[PDB]
Enzyme design. Structure first.
Site, PDB file in Angstrom:
ATOM      1  CB  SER A 114       0.300   5.803  -1.358  1.00 44.79           C
ATOM      2  OG  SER A 114       1.481   5.791  -0.572  1.00 44.79           O
ATOM      3  CE  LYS A 115       5.153   8.944   0.340  1.00 41.25           C
ATOM      4  NZ  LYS A 115       5.209  10.424   0.441  1.00 41.25           N
TER       5      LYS A 115
ATOM      6  N   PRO B  77       0.813  -1.227   0.000  1.00 43.22           N
ATOM      7  CG  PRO B  77      -0.938  -1.643   1.482  1.00 43.22           C
ATOM      8  CD  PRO B  77       0.410  -2.164   1.067  1.00 43.22           C
ATOM      9  CE1 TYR B  78       5.249   5.760   2.720  1.00 42.60           C
ATOM     10  CE2 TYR B  78       7.026   4.437   1.782  1.00 42.60           C
ATOM     11  CZ  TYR B  78       6.571   5.626   2.310  1.00 42.60           C
ATOM     12  OH  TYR B  78       7.460   6.669   2.431  1.00 42.60           O
ATOM     13  CB  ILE B  79       5.278   0.554  -2.894  1.00 41.50           C
ATOM     14  CG1 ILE B  79       6.593   0.342  -2.134  1.00 41.50           C
ATOM     15  CG2 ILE B  79       5.481   0.510  -4.415  1.00 41.50           C
ATOM     16  CD1 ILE B  79       7.340  -0.940  -2.535  1.00 41.50           C
TER      17      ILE B  79
END
Lengths: 241, 247, 247, 242
Positions: free
Chosen positions: C159-160, C155-157
């Protein structure tokens, strides 16, 4: 006239697996090689035994005179050169230091100048609708110590592939590259312990050794109908590592 | 009371007699480096760069050496380090960009480009890896045109893609020494060589390629190189920074 | 600020209370920007940043806003611009990094990070596009971990990577305004949050991953942001600069 | 009824339909997933069956968690297995990066990115060892065209998930990949264009023609079959060189 593929480096390993698969797909295969005839002849005879058609031609792909002769001779077989696969290369280790300059010069000469010549002659010989495929390497992404000369040569090869795809505009010729990781060639297995093998087999998320046939199937996709809209691409075939 | 004023660092710049290399040499001098202006042929431009550096309150001298000849490169690094006893930063900006399609007729050009740009870069990077101290900086010039794969740029792009590969591998080979290795990849830049052959209309057409809608200047490339060579670039390593105005 | 105690430029920094955003705010204030220290929750840390900037001789103030809240971001930009009449530079460093594997049970955390990091980024970029004058700069923070694709970073990747996509498109959408849009992509950095989640053994293991063999610091990220915000970054546009020690 | 089975989202029309058709030709029972009106999905199922294949259509909004749970339950129950999952559903509205575009942005991210997250997540829980998971991305990421911000952001997110899922499925022998097409000659593509506009697009690729949905589906077929066994964590751009 039978559709015809020229494969450099086709006497062993990935190049041989490509030769075999293209023969199974119906191409007459020119098995090009540089060293001893024996492995190339083994490849040819295996192809014919399985029902295909093939012949072997010796040529140093980095010698401009031998490459000219190679393409003249190969095109004369069936009057056509539908597919060119450049798989020949060498992978010596040498760190970036002045003492490595000979190794550097050799790698660049064999892998990069070699690729240039094969691509240039292919661009002049391949018909409309043809396919040009070069072998690069997955290891570019890792930039490991001592892989500098090798990675530099193959990054150069990829740059040539992308430019050639644009230079062949109007001819409907795709130019692509396939970048394998290590595969389970006979040379791979002989030169390693069962422990180094087990360690390498764990590296991919799929957790096995990749095979030359598994590289050749992607090359065969690019050479056939399913590959017609793939152009100027480097497909990494490494199991996810 | 800067470390640079307490103990002055030394920077070697190849291709420093004109264009981006000159702009780099001048910028590094203004940041306080003693600059070795390395050049290949006639010395008049290299001496002009040295004299401009000195007139602006800097320190510099010039050394002739063909970066693509291995004996001349060994001699260059011996002489450059002997000036101040140290070689803190190495910037490789020398190179050529002829047009040649991927055809048998282009084989001489290819051989020359690979020789000058790729083997040359190998020789500089290798010698820099041998000479630079711990904490030093190695910076090569690549090119933004790698992204475009334009016809006739094959040999040039192959040479510079090779340089980038060497850059990443060298960053790894120098683990433990605290040396960063990076590249800067400019797009078209407002050098004398860029402007010389072009009409005002052709220049304007090039200007329109970037969203910023002008010609980028050599000093704008040199500022990024300067960042890599100094304190703000300490944690940038194995990177290729494209400086092209968004083109 | 100049003789008339007017800051030459104004910069809005989101997430500036702690960590990388704080290092950015401090460095930009040092370079001469007035700094809006933006924050989402409680203001004690943001106020501490403001007071440190003022004590060092700068001008700063803290403004509350949830970056993923459309109305609070509208008010944020209206208030920030009103301080000196212009909002020259916008740096977006606010974000969260929860760990969750790609499984249905992770949908809430996925929704959280997408809402905070991606929608948040979209709002800040969009309002920045509407507010920054010609000649201004927009800088988003991304992450180097995109290159690694480690488990639980999905999820973090995502978003970025979405943020980087917005960055590249915005640089083209602002054609004609002389506004660069870039991202800075740190690797692991020695922040309060980073140390909270690791043992000393884990920290040492992370340190040896970079050829430079230490943890990066917030100031080492901020220096590259400052380059992009100032004169040496004028021709860097639509770029993601990874700052990770060669990791 | 232990036939290898493939679930295709967005299989009503265009590339998704071409994927469903090719996988049926390759021997898979195909679940044609759709969200809105049933007519085109039914047409796809009927064409597959008439060509000698096996297929059925399941309605579900890919971005709704309750409906996706239901979809994977139903799809697995047909044959007790879900060997291949291709996520092709998505939307491509134009909206510039401005405050007024916030609704459009929210809609794209929800449908394309959350949607992909749900399919991938449920596929990671359902696919057997040896299975294959394939997402549809886009080639236009490379071009960063104005008004494509929300769309590119959503699809770059999809790609990040693909790479992470490939590592999270270590030990299961499941490949995760993406196919990133350029524009393609669908009915909808040709609908809004004169001869001249299509000619202008056909000039863009070095191959100088319009790409077809079958030409995308063939790369998806490679990934789903024997020849893709060692392709893992890859985004293959299929765009004719442009």
């Amino acid at each position: 006239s039978r559709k015809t593929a020229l494969v450099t480096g086709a006497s062993r390993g990935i190049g041989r697996a490509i030769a075999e698969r293209l023969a199974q797909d119906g191409f007459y295969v020119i098995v090009n090689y540089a060293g001893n005839k024996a492995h190339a002849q083994a490849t040819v005879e295996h192809i014919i035994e399985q029902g295909g058609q093939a012949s072997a031609i010796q040529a140093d792909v980095a010698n401009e005179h031998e490459v000219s002769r190679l393409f003249q001779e190969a095109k004369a077989i069936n009057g056509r050169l539908d597919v060119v696969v450049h798989s020949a290369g060498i992978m010596p280790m040498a760190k970036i230091t002045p003492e490595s300059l000979p190794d550097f010069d050799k790698v660049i000469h064999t892998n990069l100048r070699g690729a240039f010549l094969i691509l240039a002659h292919a661009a002049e010989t391949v018909p409309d609708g043809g396919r040009i495929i070069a072998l690069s390497t997955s290891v570019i992404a890792k930039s490991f110590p001592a892989y500098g000369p090798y990675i530099a040569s193959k990054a150069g090869v990829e740059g040539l592939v992308h430019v050639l795809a644009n230079e062949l505009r109007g001819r409907n010729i795709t130019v692509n590259a396939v970048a394998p990781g290590p595969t389970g060639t006979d040379l791979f297995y002989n030169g390693k312990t069962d422990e180094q093998v087990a360690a390498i087999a764990k590296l991919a998320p799929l957790e096995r050794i990749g095979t030359p046939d598994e590289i050749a199937g992607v090359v065969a996709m690019l050479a056939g109908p399913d590959g017609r809209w793939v152009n100027s691409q480097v497909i990494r075939v490494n199991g996810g590592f």
